Design a protein around this nucleic acid. Structure first.
Lengths: 58, 116, 94, 71
RNA sequence: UGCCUGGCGGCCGUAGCGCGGUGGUCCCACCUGACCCCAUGCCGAACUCAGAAGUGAAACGCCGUAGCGCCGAUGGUAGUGUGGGGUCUCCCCAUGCGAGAGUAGGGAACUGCCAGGCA
RNA sequence: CCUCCUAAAGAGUAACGGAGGAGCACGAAGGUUGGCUAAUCCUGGUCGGACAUCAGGAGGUUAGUGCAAUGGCAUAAGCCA
RNA sequence: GGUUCUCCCCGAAAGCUAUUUAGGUAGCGCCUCGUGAAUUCAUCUCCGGGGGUAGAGCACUGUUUCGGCCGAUGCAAACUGCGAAUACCGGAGAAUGUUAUCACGGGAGACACACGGCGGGUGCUAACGUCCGUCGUGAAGAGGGAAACAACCCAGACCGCCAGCUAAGGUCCCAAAGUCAUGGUUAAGUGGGAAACGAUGUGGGAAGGCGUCGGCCUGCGCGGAAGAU
């Protein structure tokens, strides 16, 4: 399906291990890193998990 | 309370036989008529049913309910089971007493050569 | 008889309800019958003004949205514990 | 003017438990054995054959039965 | 293939509680005596022996009664994970999940097999 | 060594924390078959009125199951032979 | 107490179960190297579970009050006819992750942790008082901000550049950047010290009164409000 750009906005230093694992699953390493990911319900839930520091180009 | 007590008392063996999942032979005894049914482990289908009301076996019987009628029902069920292949069903007394017509029917059924 | 102006709901959820309350609005529901229920949006000021009359509890309400006449009756209303404001109403089509 | 004991369900629904596994070690009988499930002297439900574990509500009293189906 | 009756399962208050009516064609029920198979922690109390000799008394099958009870939306409400803010004892903001109760509505249940009477 | 909470609906998770009891007993209170299975309350009894007993009912597990306490328990895990 | 040359990779803990124990003894957990092995493990989506916590409710165990124990109304740690989110177990699935998973072996280190956020117990529901479950920082993290100031906010330093963008925080001078704009509030240097009470101070707002005289609410000021060269 149509793909989307996911970019990391804020750092993940003080975030929870769950949020760190979510960022690892998304594939974001550094602040401002952008990745291309296909849009699926699982990816949408993963984004919503850490929505406070990820920007999505819908 | 007679029917309710009878059903409650029979429910003991009725549930006990279900754990091992074997075909069961149940008998419903009434002064007017007698019935004997073979029920599969599922509990919704009967392999063979015999009744005293039907004229197939009541022609030679003076009355539908008596020791002779019970013996005839037992022998008919036994022969039908032999020709169907029940493979040694278990037995249930339906909460009755194994001293009168129930015992006569059981003896008649076992006479054919059953191993229950 | 009385003319009521309302708006058609588009969003459903607690977020939408909070938006309506904060924007001088409040949602409402009309049901009754074999047809599906309809969610509507009504401004708070007009309903507050109309609630003053004693005939409100004795008159069948007429709703006109998108040029469609709906004849309903007040089945239930929701009132804040201490704030004199209206937040929701369930109505039955008569 | 002590030491806590271990309770609760050990194996939940969908687990392909083995024969003799203790599905639940409870105080009394919170759930009743159904098909292919035993009942120990201490009222412990243990599996009798390999398969999946299911909980089903049946009976006039609406009592939950623990049962094992084919794996 | 339709009505009625019993037995065997699923479902376990949409199967229940209260009220009026209907069932002896078949089936089911009330019962005589038991000195006879059997028995009372006394009682033939319960089971067993011979039915229409009479009946549907009571139980049970069915129709209506929405009176009680049950389930049950949409919506809202309280609550809550995550990030932030405030006057930080407490509350709010964006997002996700979402109460109980009640309202609309339903229902006086349904379904699988065997047996028997009437068609 | 056991009986519920604080202990934030898996288990676990604090301060001579809040709480008592067993440190026994039944060698029958063990196993098996048949049958039975209330408590409680209204009413009749010489007194009995409910309270020293029985039978006509409402009601279906509130009685019980050896224990201090606890869950689950009428196909009673009870209660007669 | 001391323990002497350099570079590279990974990189902890101050916790849980026993003690005639409290400074110590065993196992697990945490670190590293080697070997072997399953889409092994992690995030997320859907599905099957036991919940009995929040919420609600008095039907279950109980409490106060009301009409004269009967009925009703509110309420709860050893209250639930109902019942979340969250957490836990298992099954299926796209994507990412240097296998991050598991087992064995060699080597350890550590065994007075501190502070802060979140929800409780305790405490006189007075304390920057006390203990818990979870997470973060320091310990072992350099850099920027709060004047300095481990516990706060942003952010994890391989090296070099007199290159650009930005997070927190700021743009009158010290000192880099708005003496920028728009609509307001304050007269107290309030800002730049603090809650209860009291008050002819002000803008604004919904409701009164038979041209009329007054009441209610929000915002910002005043004594209490007091730190020692």
């Amino acid at each position: 399906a149509k793909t989307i750009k996911i970019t990391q906005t804020r750092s993940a230093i003080g975030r929870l291990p769950k949020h760190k694992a979510t960022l690892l699953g998304l594939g974001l390493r550094r602040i401002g890193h952008t990745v291309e990911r296909e849009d699926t319900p699982a990816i949408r839930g993963m984004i919503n998990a850490v929505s406070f520091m990820v920007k999505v180009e819908e | 309370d007679k029917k309710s007590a009878r059903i409650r008392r029979a429910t003991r063996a009725r549930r006990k036989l279900q754990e091992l999942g074997a075909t069961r032979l149940v008998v419903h005894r009434t002064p007017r008529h007698i019935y004997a049914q073979v029920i599969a482990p599922n509990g919704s289908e009967v392999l063979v049913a015999a009744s005293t009301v039907e004229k197939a076996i009541a022609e030679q019987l003076k009355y539908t309910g008596n020791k002779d009628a019970a013996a005839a029902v037992g022998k008919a069920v036994a022969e039908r089971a032999l020709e169907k292949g029940i493979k040694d069903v278990s037995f249930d007394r339906s909460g009755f007493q194994y001293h009168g017509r129930v015992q006569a029917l059981a003896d008649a059924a076992r006479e054919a050569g059953l191993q229950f | 008889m009385f003319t009521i102006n309302a708006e058609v709901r588009k969003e459903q959820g607690k977020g939408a309800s909070r938006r309506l309350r904060a924007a001088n609005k409040f949602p409402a529901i009309i049901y009754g019958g074999k047809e599906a229920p309809l969610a509507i949006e009504l401004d708070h000021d007009k309903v507050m003004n109309m609630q003053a009359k004693a005939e409100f509890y004795s008159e069948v309400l007429t709703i006109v949205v998108d040029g469609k006449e709906i004849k309903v009756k007040a089945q239930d209303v929701q009132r804040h514990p201490y704030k004199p404001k209206l937040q929701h109403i369930d109505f039955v089509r008569a | 003017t002590s030491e806590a004991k271990r309770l609760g369900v050990k194996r939940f629904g969908g687990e392909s438990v083995l024969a003799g596994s203790i599905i639940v070690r409870q105080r009394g009988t919170k759930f009743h054995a159904g098909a292919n499930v035993g009942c120990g002297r201490d009222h412990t439900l243990f599996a009798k054959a390999d398969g999946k574990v299911k909980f089903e509500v049946k009976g006039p009293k609406n009592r939950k039965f623990i049962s094992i189906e084919a794996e």
